[PDB]
Short mmCIF file of N, CA and C in Angstrom, two decimals:
data_model
loop_
_atom_site.label_atom_id
_atom_site.label_comp_id
_atom_site.label_asym_id
_atom_site.label_seq_id
_atom_site.Cartn_x
_atom_site.Cartn_y
_atom_site.Cartn_z
N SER N 1 0.82 -1.20 0.00
CA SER N 1 0.00 0.00 0.00
C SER N 1 0.86 1.26 0.00
N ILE N 2 1.93 1.24 -0.79
CA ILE N 2 2.85 2.36 -0.91
C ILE N 2 2.32 3.33 -1.94
N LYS N 3 2.43 4.63 -1.65
CA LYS N 3 1.98 5.67 -2.56
C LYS N 3 3.02 6.77 -2.61
N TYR N 4 3.41 7.15 -3.82
CA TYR N 4 4.38 8.22 -4.04
C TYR N 4 3.69 9.39 -4.73
N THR N 5 3.99 10.60 -4.28
CA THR N 5 3.44 11.80 -4.89
C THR N 5 4.54 12.84 -5.01
N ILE N 6 4.65 13.44 -6.19
CA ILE N 6 5.72 14.38 -6.50
C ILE N 6 5.11 15.62 -7.13
N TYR N 7 5.51 16.80 -6.65
CA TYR N 7 5.02 18.07 -7.16
C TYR N 7 6.18 18.97 -7.54
N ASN N 8 6.09 19.56 -8.73
CA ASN N 8 6.96 20.66 -9.15
C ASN N 8 8.44 20.30 -9.00
N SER N 9 8.79 19.08 -9.35
CA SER N 9 10.15 18.59 -9.19
C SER N 9 10.84 18.48 -10.54
N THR N 10 12.13 18.15 -10.49
CA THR N 10 12.95 18.02 -11.68
C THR N 10 13.83 16.79 -11.54
N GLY N 11 13.95 16.02 -12.62
CA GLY N 11 14.84 14.88 -12.62
C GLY N 11 14.37 13.72 -11.76
N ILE N 12 13.30 13.05 -12.17
CA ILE N 12 12.76 11.91 -11.44
C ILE N 12 13.10 10.64 -12.21
N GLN N 13 13.67 9.66 -11.52
CA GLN N 13 13.92 8.34 -12.07
C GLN N 13 13.18 7.31 -11.23
N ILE N 14 12.37 6.48 -11.88
CA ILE N 14 11.59 5.45 -11.20
C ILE N 14 11.95 4.13 -11.86
N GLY N 15 12.78 3.34 -11.19
CA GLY N 15 13.24 2.08 -11.74
C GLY N 15 14.51 1.64 -11.05
N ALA N 16 15.10 0.58 -11.60
CA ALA N 16 16.29 -0.02 -11.02
C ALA N 16 17.49 0.18 -11.94
N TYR N 17 18.67 0.15 -11.32
CA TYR N 17 19.95 0.24 -12.04
C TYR N 17 20.06 1.52 -12.86
N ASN N 18 19.50 2.61 -12.33
CA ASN N 18 19.58 3.90 -12.99
C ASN N 18 20.82 4.66 -12.54
N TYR N 19 21.24 5.61 -13.37
CA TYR N 19 22.36 6.47 -13.06
C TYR N 19 21.92 7.92 -13.17
N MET N 20 22.33 8.74 -12.21
CA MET N 20 21.98 10.15 -12.19
C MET N 20 23.18 10.96 -11.75
N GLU N 21 23.43 12.06 -12.47
CA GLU N 21 24.52 12.98 -12.14
C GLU N 21 23.93 14.37 -12.01
N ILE N 22 24.16 15.01 -10.87
CA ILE N 22 23.64 16.34 -10.60
C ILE N 22 24.81 17.30 -10.46
N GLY N 23 24.77 18.38 -11.22
CA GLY N 23 25.83 19.38 -11.19
C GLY N 23 25.30 20.72 -10.70
N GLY N 24 26.15 21.45 -9.99
CA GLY N 24 25.77 22.75 -9.46
C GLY N 24 25.64 23.82 -10.54
N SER Y 1 0.56 -3.11 -4.98
CA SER Y 1 -0.40 -2.01 -4.92
C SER Y 1 0.31 -0.67 -4.85
N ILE Y 2 1.37 -0.52 -5.64
CA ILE Y 2 2.15 0.70 -5.69
C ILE Y 2 1.51 1.66 -6.68
N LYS Y 3 1.47 2.94 -6.31
CA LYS Y 3 0.89 3.97 -7.17
C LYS Y 3 1.80 5.19 -7.16
N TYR Y 4 2.14 5.68 -8.35
CA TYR Y 4 2.97 6.86 -8.51
C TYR Y 4 2.15 7.97 -9.14
N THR Y 5 2.32 9.19 -8.63
CA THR Y 5 1.62 10.34 -9.17
C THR Y 5 2.59 11.51 -9.24
N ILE Y 6 2.63 12.18 -10.39
CA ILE Y 6 3.58 13.25 -10.65
C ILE Y 6 2.83 14.45 -11.21
N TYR Y 7 3.10 15.63 -10.66
CA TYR Y 7 2.46 16.86 -11.11
C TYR Y 7 3.50 17.91 -11.44
N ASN Y 8 3.34 18.55 -12.60
CA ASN Y 8 4.08 19.76 -12.96
C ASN Y 8 5.59 19.57 -12.82
N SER Y 9 6.08 18.42 -13.24
CA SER Y 9 7.48 18.08 -13.10
C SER Y 9 8.18 18.12 -14.45
N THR Y 10 9.49 17.95 -14.41
CA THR Y 10 10.32 17.97 -15.61
C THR Y 10 11.33 16.85 -15.53
N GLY Y 11 11.54 16.16 -16.65
CA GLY Y 11 12.55 15.12 -16.71
C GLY Y 11 12.23 13.88 -15.91
N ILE Y 12 11.24 13.11 -16.36
CA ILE Y 12 10.84 11.87 -15.70
C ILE Y 12 11.32 10.70 -16.53
N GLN Y 13 12.00 9.76 -15.89
CA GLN Y 13 12.40 8.50 -16.51
C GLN Y 13 11.80 7.35 -15.73
N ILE Y 14 11.08 6.48 -16.42
CA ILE Y 14 10.43 5.33 -15.80
C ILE Y 14 10.94 4.09 -16.52
N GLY Y 15 11.86 3.37 -15.89
CA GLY Y 15 12.45 2.20 -16.51
C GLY Y 15 13.77 1.88 -15.84
N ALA Y 16 14.47 0.92 -16.44
CA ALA Y 16 15.73 0.43 -15.90
C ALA Y 16 16.90 0.82 -16.80
N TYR Y 17 18.08 0.90 -16.18
CA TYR Y 17 19.33 1.17 -16.89
C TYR Y 17 19.28 2.50 -17.64
N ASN Y 18 18.61 3.48 -17.06
CA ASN Y 18 18.53 4.80 -17.65
C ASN Y 18 19.68 5.68 -17.16
N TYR Y 19 19.98 6.71 -17.93
CA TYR Y 19 21.00 7.69 -17.58
C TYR Y 19 20.39 9.08 -17.61
N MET Y 20 20.71 9.88 -16.61
CA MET Y 20 20.19 11.24 -16.52
C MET Y 20 21.29 12.17 -16.04
N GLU Y 21 21.42 13.32 -16.69
CA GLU Y 21 22.39 14.34 -16.32
C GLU Y 21 21.65 15.65 -16.12
N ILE Y 22 21.80 16.25 -14.94
CA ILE Y 22 21.13 17.49 -14.60
C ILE Y 22 22.19 18.57 -14.41
N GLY Y 23 22.02 19.68 -15.11
CA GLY Y 23 22.95 20.80 -15.03
C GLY Y 23 22.28 22.03 -14.48
N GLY Y 24 23.03 22.82 -13.72
CA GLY Y 24 22.51 24.04 -13.13
C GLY Y 24 22.25 25.13 -14.14
N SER P 1 0.50 -4.75 -10.05
CA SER P 1 -0.58 -3.77 -9.93
C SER P 1 -0.03 -2.36 -9.80
N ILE P 2 1.00 -2.05 -10.58
CA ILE P 2 1.64 -0.74 -10.56
C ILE P 2 0.88 0.19 -11.50
N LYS P 3 0.70 1.43 -11.07
CA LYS P 3 0.00 2.43 -11.87
C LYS P 3 0.76 3.75 -11.79
N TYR P 4 1.04 4.33 -12.95
CA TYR P 4 1.73 5.61 -13.05
C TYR P 4 0.78 6.65 -13.63
N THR P 5 0.80 7.85 -13.05
CA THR P 5 -0.02 8.94 -13.53
C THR P 5 0.81 10.21 -13.54
N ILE P 6 0.76 10.94 -14.65
CA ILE P 6 1.58 12.13 -14.85
C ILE P 6 0.69 13.26 -15.35
N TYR P 7 0.82 14.44 -14.74
CA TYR P 7 0.04 15.60 -15.13
C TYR P 7 0.96 16.79 -15.40
N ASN P 8 0.71 17.46 -16.52
CA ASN P 8 1.31 18.77 -16.82
C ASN P 8 2.83 18.75 -16.68
N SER P 9 3.45 17.68 -17.16
CA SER P 9 4.88 17.50 -17.04
C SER P 9 5.56 17.70 -18.39
N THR P 10 6.89 17.67 -18.36
CA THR P 10 7.70 17.85 -19.55
C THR P 10 8.84 16.85 -19.53
N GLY P 11 9.12 16.25 -20.68
CA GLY P 11 10.24 15.35 -20.80
C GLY P 11 10.07 14.03 -20.06
N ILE P 12 9.18 13.18 -20.55
CA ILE P 12 8.92 11.87 -19.95
C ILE P 12 9.54 10.80 -20.85
N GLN P 13 10.33 9.92 -20.25
CA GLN P 13 10.87 8.75 -20.94
C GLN P 13 10.40 7.50 -20.22
N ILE P 14 9.79 6.58 -20.96
CA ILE P 14 9.28 5.33 -20.40
C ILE P 14 9.92 4.20 -21.18
N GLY P 15 10.92 3.57 -20.59
CA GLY P 15 11.64 2.51 -21.27
C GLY P 15 13.00 2.31 -20.62
N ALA P 16 13.80 1.47 -21.26
CA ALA P 16 15.11 1.10 -20.75
C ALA P 16 16.22 1.66 -21.62
N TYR P 17 17.39 1.85 -21.00
CA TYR P 17 18.60 2.30 -21.69
C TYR P 17 18.39 3.65 -22.37
N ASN P 18 17.62 4.52 -21.74
CA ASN P 18 17.38 5.86 -22.26
C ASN P 18 18.42 6.83 -21.72
N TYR P 19 18.60 7.93 -22.44
CA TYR P 19 19.50 9.00 -22.04
C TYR P 19 18.73 10.31 -22.00
N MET P 20 18.96 11.09 -20.96
CA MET P 20 18.29 12.37 -20.80
C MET P 20 19.27 13.39 -20.26
N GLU P 21 19.26 14.58 -20.85
CA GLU P 21 20.11 15.69 -20.43
C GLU P 21 19.22 16.89 -20.16
N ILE P 22 19.31 17.45 -18.96
CA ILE P 22 18.50 18.58 -18.55
C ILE P 22 19.42 19.77 -18.30
N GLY P 23 19.13 20.89 -18.94
CA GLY P 23 19.93 22.09 -18.80
C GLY P 23 19.11 23.21 -18.18
N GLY P 24 19.78 24.04 -17.39
CA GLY P 24 19.12 25.16 -16.73
C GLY P 24 18.73 26.27 -17.69
N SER Z 1 0.61 -6.13 -15.20
CA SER Z 1 -0.58 -5.29 -15.04
C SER Z 1 -0.20 -3.83 -14.82
N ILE Z 2 0.79 -3.37 -15.59
CA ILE Z 2 1.27 -2.00 -15.50
C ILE Z 2 0.41 -1.11 -16.39
N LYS Z 3 0.08 0.08 -15.89
CA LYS Z 3 -0.73 1.03 -16.64
C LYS Z 3 -0.13 2.42 -16.50
N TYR Z 4 0.08 3.09 -17.62
CA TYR Z 4 0.61 4.44 -17.66
C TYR Z 4 -0.46 5.39 -18.17
N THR Z 5 -0.57 6.55 -17.53
CA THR Z 5 -1.52 7.57 -17.96
C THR Z 5 -0.84 8.93 -17.90
N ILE Z 6 -0.98 9.70 -18.97
CA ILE Z 6 -0.30 10.99 -19.11
C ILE Z 6 -1.32 12.03 -19.55
N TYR Z 7 -1.32 13.18 -18.88
CA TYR Z 7 -2.23 14.27 -19.20
C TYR Z 7 -1.46 15.56 -19.41
N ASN Z 8 -1.79 16.26 -20.50
CA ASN Z 8 -1.35 17.64 -20.72
C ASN Z 8 0.16 17.79 -20.59
N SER Z 9 0.89 16.83 -21.12
CA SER Z 9 2.34 16.81 -21.00
C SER Z 9 2.99 17.15 -22.34
N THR Z 10 4.31 17.28 -22.31
CA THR Z 10 5.09 17.62 -23.49
C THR Z 10 6.34 16.76 -23.52
N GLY Z 11 6.68 16.26 -24.70
CA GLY Z 11 7.90 15.49 -24.86
C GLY Z 11 7.89 14.13 -24.20
N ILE Z 12 7.10 13.21 -24.73
CA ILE Z 12 7.00 11.85 -24.20
C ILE Z 12 7.72 10.91 -25.15
N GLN Z 13 8.62 10.09 -24.60
CA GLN Z 13 9.29 9.03 -25.35
C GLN Z 13 8.97 7.70 -24.70
N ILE Z 14 8.46 6.76 -25.48
CA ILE Z 14 8.11 5.43 -24.99
C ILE Z 14 8.88 4.42 -25.83
N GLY Z 15 9.94 3.88 -25.28
CA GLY Z 15 10.78 2.95 -26.00
C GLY Z 15 12.15 2.87 -25.36
N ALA Z 16 13.05 2.17 -26.05
CA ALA Z 16 14.39 1.92 -25.55
C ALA Z 16 15.42 2.66 -26.40
N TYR Z 17 16.56 2.95 -25.77
CA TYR Z 17 17.71 3.57 -26.43
C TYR Z 17 17.35 4.93 -27.04
N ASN Z 18 16.48 5.66 -26.36
CA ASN Z 18 16.08 6.99 -26.81
C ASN Z 18 17.01 8.05 -26.22
N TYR Z 19 17.05 9.19 -26.88
CA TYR Z 19 17.82 10.34 -26.42
C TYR Z 19 16.91 11.54 -26.31
N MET Z 20 17.05 12.29 -25.23
CA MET Z 20 16.24 13.48 -25.00
C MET Z 20 17.10 14.58 -24.41
N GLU Z 21 16.95 15.79 -24.94
CA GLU Z 21 17.66 16.96 -24.46
C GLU Z 21 16.64 18.04 -24.13
N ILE Z 22 16.67 18.53 -22.90
CA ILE Z 22 15.74 19.55 -22.43
C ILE Z 22 16.52 20.81 -22.12
N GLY Z 23 16.09 21.92 -22.70
CA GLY Z 23 16.74 23.21 -22.50
C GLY Z 23 15.81 24.19 -21.82
N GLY Z 24 16.38 25.05 -20.99
CA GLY Z 24 15.60 26.04 -20.27
C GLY Z 24 15.08 27.15 -21.17
N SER U 1 0.86 -7.19 -20.42
CA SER U 1 -0.42 -6.51 -20.22
C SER U 1 -0.20 -5.03 -19.92
N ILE U 2 0.71 -4.41 -20.66
CA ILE U 2 1.03 -3.00 -20.50
C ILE U 2 0.07 -2.18 -21.34
N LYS U 3 -0.39 -1.06 -20.79
CA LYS U 3 -1.31 -0.17 -21.49
C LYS U 3 -0.87 1.27 -21.27
N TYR U 4 -0.75 2.02 -22.36
CA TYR U 4 -0.38 3.42 -22.32
C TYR U 4 -1.55 4.27 -22.79
N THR U 5 -1.79 5.37 -22.09
CA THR U 5 -2.86 6.29 -22.46
C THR U 5 -2.34 7.72 -22.33
N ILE U 6 -2.57 8.53 -23.36
CA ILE U 6 -2.05 9.88 -23.43
C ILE U 6 -3.18 10.82 -23.82
N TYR U 7 -3.32 11.93 -23.08
CA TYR U 7 -4.35 12.92 -23.35
C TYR U 7 -3.74 14.30 -23.49
N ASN U 8 -4.15 15.02 -24.54
CA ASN U 8 -3.87 16.45 -24.69
C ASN U 8 -2.39 16.76 -24.55
N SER U 9 -1.55 15.92 -25.13
CA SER U 9 -0.11 16.07 -25.01
C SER U 9 0.49 16.55 -26.32
N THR U 10 1.79 16.83 -26.28
CA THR U 10 2.52 17.32 -27.45
C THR U 10 3.86 16.61 -27.52
N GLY U 11 4.25 16.21 -28.72
CA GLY U 11 5.55 15.61 -28.92
C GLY U 11 5.70 14.22 -28.33
N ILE U 12 5.02 13.24 -28.91
CA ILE U 12 5.08 11.86 -28.46
C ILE U 12 5.91 11.06 -29.45
N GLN U 13 6.89 10.32 -28.95
CA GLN U 13 7.67 9.39 -29.75
C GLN U 13 7.52 7.99 -29.17
N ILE U 14 7.12 7.04 -30.00
CA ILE U 14 6.92 5.66 -29.58
C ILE U 14 7.80 4.79 -30.47
N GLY U 15 8.93 4.35 -29.94
CA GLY U 15 9.86 3.56 -30.72
C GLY U 15 11.24 3.61 -30.08
N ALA U 16 12.20 3.05 -30.80
CA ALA U 16 13.57 2.94 -30.31
C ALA U 16 14.50 3.83 -31.12
N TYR U 17 15.60 4.22 -30.47
CA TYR U 17 16.67 5.01 -31.10
C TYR U 17 16.15 6.34 -31.63
N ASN U 18 15.20 6.93 -30.92
CA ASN U 18 14.66 8.22 -31.31
C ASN U 18 15.45 9.35 -30.66
N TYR U 19 15.36 10.53 -31.26
CA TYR U 19 16.00 11.73 -30.73
C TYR U 19 14.95 12.81 -30.57
N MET U 20 15.00 13.52 -29.44
CA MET U 20 14.06 14.59 -29.16
C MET U 20 14.80 15.75 -28.51
N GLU U 21 14.50 16.96 -28.98
CA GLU U 21 15.08 18.17 -28.43
C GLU U 21 13.94 19.11 -28.04
N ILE U 22 13.92 19.54 -26.79
CA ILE U 22 12.87 20.41 -26.27
C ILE U 22 13.50 21.74 -25.89
N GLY U 23 12.95 22.82 -26.42
CA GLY U 23 13.45 24.16 -26.15
C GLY U 23 12.41 24.99 -25.42
N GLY U 24 12.88 25.87 -24.54
CA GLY U 24 11.99 26.73 -23.77
C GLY U 24 11.34 27.81 -24.61
#
C-alpha cells in the first residue's frame, strides 16, 4: 500500500539500475 | 499495490538502466 | 498492480537504456 | 498489469535507447 | 499486459533510437 506523490520537481527516475549525475 | 503520481514536473524517466544528467 | 499517472509535465521517458540531459 | 496515464504533457518518449535533451 | 494512455499532449515518440530536443 505504498503511494508516491511528486510536485513541481525536476529529474525523477523510477526504476532499477539507474544512473543520475547532478551538477551545481 | 504501488501507485505513482507526478504533477508539474520535468525530466521523468520510468524504466531500468537509464542515464540522466542534470545541469545548473 | 503498478500504476503511473503524470500531469502537466515535460520530458517523460518510459523505457530502458534511455538517455536524458536537462539544462538550466 | 502496468498502466501508464499521461495528461497535458510535453515530450513523451516510450521505447528503448532513446535520447532526449531539455533546454531552459 | 502493458497499457499506455495519453491525453492532450505534445511531442510523443513511440519507438527505439529516437531523438528529441525540447526548447523553452
